[PDB]
């Protein structure tokens, strides 16, 4: 079985809209989301459908861009670092689970390169 997905709503959690978080949605997430290699990363890994009974034994902090997108749209984060951490967790999970050079890793590498290029222009917090 699949675990519940990561939390995207929590009324009592402290949260903000900041200019940096706005950039993370409008530039960073949008750029990665539209890419031809986004699809494995647009939703939680479905370990049931893919018959990957070890995935959620190995990966204990799952993360995906569908979750990130929801968190950004809901203004769920407190700060940009929290969101950047989610992207990095997503990439790192991929590299932990998949084999170096395999198609999924290649896809993650392409997205991560773009991520790094866009986060270069993260604005100073207003």
């Amino acid at each position: 079985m699949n675990p519940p997905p990561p939390e995207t709503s929590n009324p009592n959690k402290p949260k903000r809209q900041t200019n940096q978080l706005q950039y993370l949605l409008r530039v960073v997430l949008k750029t990665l989301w539209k890419h031809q290699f986004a699809w494995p990363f647009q939703q939680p890994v479905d370990a049931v459908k893919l018959n990957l009974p070890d995935y959620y034994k190995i990966i204990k902090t799952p993360m995906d861009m569908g979750t990130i997108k929801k968190r950004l749209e809901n203004n769920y984060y407190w700060n940009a670092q929290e969101c950047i951490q989610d992207f990095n967790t997503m990439f790192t999970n991929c590299y932990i689970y998949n084999k170096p050079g395999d198609d999924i890793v290649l896809m993650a590498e392409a997205l991560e390169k773009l991520f790094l290029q866009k986060i270069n222009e993260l604005p100073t917090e207003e």
């Binding site: 998949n98 050079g101 395999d102 198609d103 999924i104």
Partner: peptide, 8 residues
């Protein structure tokens, strides 16, 4: 190359 993840 062909990835194990999708080798259902």
């Amino acid at each position: 190359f062909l990835p194990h993840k999708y080798d259902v």
